[PDB]
Write a protein that binds this DNA or RNA. Structure first.
Ligand code: MG
Ligand code: MG
Ligand code: MG
Ligand code: MG
Ligand code: MG
Ligand code: MG
Ligand code: MG
Ligand code: MG
Ligand code: MG
Ligand code: MG
Ligand code: MG
Ligand code: MG
Ligand code: MG
Ligand code: MG
Ligand code: MG
Ligand code: MG
Ligand code: MG
Ligand code: MG
Ligand code: MG
Ligand code: MG
Ligand code: MG
Ligand code: MG
Ligand code: MG
Ligand code: MG
Ligand code: MG
Ligand code: MG
Ligand code: MG
Ligand code: MG
Ligand code: MG
Ligand code: MG
Ligand code: MG
Ligand code: MG
Ligand code: MG
Ligand code: MG
Ligand code: MG
Ligand code: MG
Lengths: 188, 167, 155, 131, 260
RNA sequence: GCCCGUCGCUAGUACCGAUUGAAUGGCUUAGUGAGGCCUCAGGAUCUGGGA
RNA sequence: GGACUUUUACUUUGAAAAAAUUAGAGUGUUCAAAGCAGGCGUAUUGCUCGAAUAUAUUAGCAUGGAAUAAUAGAAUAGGACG
RNA sequence: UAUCUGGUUGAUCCUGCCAGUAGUCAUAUGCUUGUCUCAAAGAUUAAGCCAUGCAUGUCUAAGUAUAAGCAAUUUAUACAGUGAAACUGCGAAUGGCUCAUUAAAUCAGUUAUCGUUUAUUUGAUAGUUCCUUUACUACAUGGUAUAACUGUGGUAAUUCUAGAGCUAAUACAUGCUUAAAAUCUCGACCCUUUGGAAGAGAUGUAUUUAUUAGAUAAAAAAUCAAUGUCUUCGGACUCUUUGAUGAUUCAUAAUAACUUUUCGAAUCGCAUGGCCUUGUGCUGGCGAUGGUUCAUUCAAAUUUCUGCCCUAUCAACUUUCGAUGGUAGGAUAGUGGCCUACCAUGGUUUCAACGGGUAACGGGGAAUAAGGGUUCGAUUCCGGAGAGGGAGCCUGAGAAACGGCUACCA
């Protein structure tokens, strides 16, 4: 099928290289997962030497990490908003690594308020203890508190769904969220 | 003589591409497909034979079929299969309820029964005993050499606090 | 090569797993990761000082140097972040018991930490295939220029 | 796919084919030791010239050089052994000298005659070849 | 070429085996195991070409299949089984125990060793790391994995091994002035001491060496195998104690030994 | 005495040359496109959403 | 371990190195081309020498040399040590 | 192992070729042909075509046996000896042959994997599996559905197979489990402190992600936000723990979670014994097959430096439809323009690029013997490529396999 050899491909001098031997199965390559949104559906693929690889095609939930918060939840993936490599990925809502997506927010809400006792946006015994043991550590951040209003947080895909069948990432923040923000709107 | 092949429709013949686990094909090598012809699943006058199977028996005995009745060759061989052909509860002991087949050797009439498999026997339990035992035996073993090494490092830090108490 | 902007890509540029928690107010903004590639090459402070990202930096990237250590005079600086040196050498023809001038043009990747101009002698280090052609990396600049600021105007 | 069976020739052949004087010298040699063809001479002088080569070669390397001592004595001792080389001239410029007849005088063909027992270098042959 | 090669052409066989050119056209390809191809000695070679104990190889099968032979303690039934350096071959009949060990010419010798020295082996930790669950381990040149070694123990040090039980009883660091046995090169089989070690960051550390004859030489550190103190070796060395005489020297000793 | 060329004979080689001459082999634009693999569907039937 | 090193060519020595082939030692295949054997006894219950050495280069590595032959440095001092 | 000789003239000395001469692990052919040993051999031309036969099959006490098979004997009324067939397992990816293509390709010497996959062998390695956690989940062992066979058939034809009826497992598919401990989160109550607490759950390994640890370039101080261990209640913190490399985000570990959840023995053989509260209770010897991770070994894939024959009547080559590089992704076992998207304008060249030729596989080597050279290597060892020409793919640890398949061409 596809061959990752370099023995086609003109020489750096520009010369044309002859055919030497036929395609080998080990220099092969397979097609793209082009994994998309919704209804979990994955196909294991027999790679070299035993070893499955897991091709995601349609994924709808994934594990996402509040980085500056040291937790993680799985949430629905709302969809794709930005992609540095190809725009058609955004338009087809294709999940790939480095994709920029939106996620369910609320499970990160449910945790926060139950951990800080503060509620985003806009009375037990030892509970009060903990909530008051924290804060001065609850300040969150202007543009990350914001997104909660919408019930949709911006997060970068970090996994390689074509490979692992997972669709995992981290909520955007700080300097990095600042980047995609500026990008997102001055094109919107 | 090309065989029909269920679920291909058509009252004609076509050339399919068959694999392991499928009608009209016995592969000859681990993961081999040969491309063979096939008659469709739609009855036509081009057939030599229909294979048919009674489903409801009408009003008149059909001589060589209803009138006569052949037995099943083999009887139950696994543990519970016996239990399930006779209905016994894991209690009634299979070893008598296995099925015995007579045979004569000129003037010696023989008797031969299966070999219940998956039968729970003392030998099995013994091996089950040894499994669990060795799993734990080494468990503790590993914990032993474990703390045996923690010492080596602990009275090495007393050898580095008597070395650092020398000079 | 780089210079300016730093964040001039469609992708956000950053070092992998070098987190900065915005919760924790800082005076340097971005924590940076660098290494000493070994073999006796000082990692120029302009790698530590700098802001460039470059995942192929032998000092601030995930490339590692090992194998051949070569030197050549820089002969072309026209490709972004990679140059092409010319290593020359005399070759022995034994029937004639004499030598002849040959050469090679090894293409090598160069980290923003160095600023190189054409003519400079360089010292490169082998690494994994980094591109179609480059299998080496600029690891020290030996020269400086060619006494250039002493080629100026009138008295 | 099996090992090589190795072989060699055992003789050289005269540059000029027809030196009337070399043929004289040769046929003399033959009928004097009862040999059948010129090859029996071609054989010897060949191995004779390789010896002289080795010698020549060695006699360039330093006196008391490692090789020409090890391989030096080896050559000398082997020659002296079979009784070609003379005991006195035991230091390998005689090996450089030497000559063909010296080798000739040691064939069992010839000894079988030299000490009685044959009276003719030819009776020598026949007897030997006749067990 | 599509897969593991399973044959050996006698000719491509390791030469220090001393197999004759003809009489066949294959040699035995050593099996997979504890030591590398190019540096082992299969049971078929030791039991037939050294020991002269079998004639056929078919016989070497019949011998081994009786569990007679046992390597490093365990039984070892494989005809081709790769036997390497420091291993312990023990014929249970005959009472005989051998430690595989090098000549000076550079081959394995038939070296009869004591019934009780045969109860332990020597081995060079080629590496040490940190394993699963934080357990550290060393791995010797025969692929022995030994968990929980000594903190002081690290690569290029040699180790004394019980064989009986798997574990290590002693070790010897790689110091200036320790006994050393060259396991490769044209100095393969030589023995002695260590002058000093040239470093060279990037690869190939040199090892300057002298023996009990004030003779020097150099090998790669990979080819070096610590084995004790000057004088005191931790194993019985074979005759000629790996000292290497000149060809002319050896020519004299063999033509001094002459009087019947 | 030697000796040069046209011209005439016999033989042989190579050239030029209407035939927009001919053959073989290697790449290749364009059009057409088998088959397997991947993929969206499909559900003969066959049991628990999957086969 | 820190802090730094103007560039080469040549040349010496050494590592790392397949065997067969070549050169070559040992050995009476009856000679020899070969082969890697074989040789000694208590030849009734074994003793024992062997299976060398060299070459192996252009490149790469390691190292001794500092002639020959290049290259770089302090002149708008934008020098050198502190 | 450093040699020449015949031929231009009437004669002469030179130039210079032709001729002679010698060898060829260098083919053929002619004539002749007795002995020993040794033994190459359809390479060259047509990698042109092939009748027929043979060249890959395989069983241990030890996965499966109701042959309606043999043997009967020797204890065996579940099984037991031997064993067709068939299932299961493993091998068929080695070997053997050929030199077609191939000129910076192969190949060689020399590097790299801090850039990967790896059956096997060898060494190491698993108390964690269930569930809102008293009227419980088969563990004294859970599920069917198939070959072989039985029988009914089809075709001129094949290593074609159909309909029916059976029945196995180390096939297929399921699914129980085991010490103490500690650490984490929750936290019913009580009581105001300086604050503590019943008890509730989570915690095998593997997978995916994010965050930490992984020190060391010689020594010290203050304060902010939390919050560790010991009171002699102003307070002190004193001993404090560190693996490898030239070098890492390494080896390894910790935190929050993720999974159509990887693995954690429903397997088989020889023996049959201890021990009492006599439950056929509880235990228990030797070793086979396995099983995850690591290591090792057999490998493999890429890979740095330098080195190829003739050719300028080949001087500019390279980016259509990647040519050189950057970012991101995808794809792979993995690096990488390998592919895609975006972006730039690069890369090579008189030190010969690019193109052409090769009656070109490369090497170890072979022939010729002053030396320097010249010529040769299809061909006993190594590497490589192919199996009529192309492409595609299944199986698998490993094939782009051809004594495997699918297609097109011939
Ligand atoms: Mg069973
Ligand atoms: Mg550019
Ligand atoms: Mg073998
Ligand atoms: Mg290294
Ligand atoms: Mg026409
Ligand atoms: Mg697709
Ligand atoms: Mg040298
Ligand atoms: Mg030799
Ligand atoms: Mg004449
Ligand atoms: Mg005349
Ligand atoms: Mg006249
Ligand atoms: Mg001539
Ligand atoms: Mg042919
Ligand atoms: Mg041939
Ligand atoms: Mg053919
Ligand atoms: Mg039976
Ligand atoms: Mg092969
Ligand atoms: Mg079923
Ligand atoms: Mg299974
Ligand atoms: Mg710290
Ligand atoms: Mg450390
Ligand atoms: Mg890691
Ligand atoms: Mg009992
Ligand atoms: Mg031309
Ligand atoms: Mg790129
Ligand atoms: Mg352009
Ligand atoms: Mg030219
Ligand atoms: Mg060719
Ligand atoms: Mg060849
Ligand atoms: Mg050639
Ligand atoms: Mg040919
Ligand atoms: Mg290679
Ligand atoms: Mg092939
Ligand atoms: Mg084609
Ligand atoms: Mg094929
Ligand atoms: Mg084949």
């Amino acid at each position: 099928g596809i061959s990752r050899d370099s023995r086609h491909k003109r020489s750096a001098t520009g010369a044309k290289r002859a055919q030497f031997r036929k395609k080998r199965k080990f220099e092969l390559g397979r097609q793209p997962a082009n994994t998309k949104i919704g209804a979990k559906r994955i196909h294991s693929v027999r790679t070299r030497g035993g070893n499955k690889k897991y091709r995601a095609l349609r994924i709808e939930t994934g594990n996402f990490s509040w980085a500056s918060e040291g937790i993680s939840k799985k949430t629905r993936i709302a969809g794709v908003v930005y992609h540095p490599s190809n725009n058609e990925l955004v338009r087809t809502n294709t999940l790939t690594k480095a994709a920029i997506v939106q996620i369910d927010a609320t499970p990160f809400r449910q945790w926060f308020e139950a951990h800080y006792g503060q509620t985003l946006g806009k009375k037990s015994k030892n509970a009060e203890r903990k909530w008051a043991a924290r804060a001065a550590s609850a300040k969150i951040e202007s543009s990350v508190e914001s997104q909660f209003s919408a019930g949709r947080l911006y997060a970068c895909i970090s996994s390689r769904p074509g490979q692992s069948g997972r669709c995992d990432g981290y909520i955007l923040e700080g300097e990095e969220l600042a980047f995609y923000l500026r990008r997102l709107t001055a094109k919107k | 003589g090309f065989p029909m092949k269920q679920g291909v429709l058509l009252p004609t013949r076509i050339k399919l591409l068959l694999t392991k686990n499928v009608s009209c094909y016995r592969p000859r090598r681990d993961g081999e497909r040969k491309r063979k012809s096939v008659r469709g699943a739609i009855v036509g006058p081009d057939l030599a034979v229909l294979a048919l199977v009674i489903v409801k028996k009408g009003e008149q005995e059909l001589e060589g079929l209803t009138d006569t009745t052949v037995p099943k060759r083999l009887g139950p061989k696994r543990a519970n299969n016996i239990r399930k052909f006779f209905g016994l509860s894991k209690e009634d002991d299979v070893r008598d309820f296995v099925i015995r087949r007579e045979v004569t050797k000129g003037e010696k009439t023989y008797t031969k029964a299966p070999k219940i498999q998956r039968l729970v026997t003392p030998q099995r339990l013994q091996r089950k005993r040894h499994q669990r035992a060795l799993k734990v035996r080494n468990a503790q073993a590993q914990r032993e050499a474990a703390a045996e090494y923690a010492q080596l490092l602990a009275k090495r830090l007393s050898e580095r606090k008597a070395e650092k108490a020398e000079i | 090569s780089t210079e300016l902007t730093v964040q001039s890509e469609r992708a956000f540029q950053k070092q992998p797993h070098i987190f900065n928690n915005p919760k924790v107010k800082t005076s340097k903004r971005t924590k940076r990761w660098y290494k000493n590639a070994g073999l006796g090459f000082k990692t120029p402070k302009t790698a530590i000082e700098g802001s460039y990202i470059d995942k192929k930096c032998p000092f601030t990237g995930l490339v590692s140097i090992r194998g051949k250590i070569l030197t050549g005079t820089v002969v072309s600086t026209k490709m972004h972040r990679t140059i092409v040196i010319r290593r020359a050498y005399l070759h022995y023809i034994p029937k004639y018991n004499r030598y002849e001038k040959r050469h090679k043009n090894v293409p090598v990747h160069v980290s923003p930490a160095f600023r190189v101009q054409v003519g400079d002698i360089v010292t490169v280090g082998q690494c994994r295939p980094i591109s179609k052609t480059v299998r080496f990396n600029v690891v020290k600049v030996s020269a400086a220029a060619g006494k250039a600021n002493k080629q100026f105007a009138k008295f | 796919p099996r090992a090589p069976r190795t072989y060699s020739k055992t003789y050289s052949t005269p540059k000029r084919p027809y030196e009337s004087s070399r043929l004289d010298a040769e046929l003399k040699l033959a009928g004097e030791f009862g040999l059948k063809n010129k090859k029996e001479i071609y054989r010897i002088s060949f191995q004779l010239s390789k010896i002289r080569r080795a010698a020549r070669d060695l006699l360039t390397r330093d006196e008391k050089d490692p090789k020409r001592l090890f391989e030096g004595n080896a050559l000398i001792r082997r020659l002296v052994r079979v009784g070609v080389l003379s005991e006195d001239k035991k230091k390998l410029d005689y090996v450089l000298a030497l000559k063909v007849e010296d080798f000739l005088e040691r064939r069992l063909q010839t000894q079988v005659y030299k000490l009685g027992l044959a009276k003719s270098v030819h009776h020598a042959r026949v007897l030997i070849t006749q067990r | 070429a599509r897969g593991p090669k399973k044959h050996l052409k006698r000719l491509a066989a390791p030469h220090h085996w001393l197999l004759d050119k003809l009489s066949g056209c294959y040699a035995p390809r050593p099996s997979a195991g504890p030591h590398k191809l190019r540096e082992s000695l299969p049971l078929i070679v030791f039991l037939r070409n050294r020991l002269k104990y079998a004639l056929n190889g078919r016989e070497v099968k019949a011998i081994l299949m009786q569990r007679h032979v046992k390597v490093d303690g365990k039984v070892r039934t494989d005809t081709t089984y790769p036997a390497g350096f420091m291993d312990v071959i023990t014929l249970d009949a005959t009472n005989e125990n051998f430690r595989l060990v090098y000549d000076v010419k550079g081959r394995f010798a038939v070296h009869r060793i004591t019934d009780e020295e045969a109860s332990y082996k020597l081995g060079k930790v080629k590496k040490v790391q940190l394993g699963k669950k934080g357990v550290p381990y060393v791995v010797t040149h025969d692929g022995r994995t030994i968990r929980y070694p000594d903190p002081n123990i690290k690569v290029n040090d040699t180790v004394k091994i019980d064989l009986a039980s798997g574990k290590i009883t002693d070790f010897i660091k790689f110091d200036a002035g320790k006994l050393v046995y060259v396991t490769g090169g044209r100095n393969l089989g030589r023995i002695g001491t260590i002058v000093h070690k040239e470093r060279h960051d990037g690869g190939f550390d040199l090892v300057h060496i002298k023996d009990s004859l004030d003779n020097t030489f150099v090998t790669r550190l990979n080819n070096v195998f610590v084995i004790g103190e000057q004088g005191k070796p931790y194993i019985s060395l074979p005759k000629g104690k790996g000292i290497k005489l000149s060809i002319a020297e050896e020519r004299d000793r063999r033509r001094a030994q002459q009087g019947l």
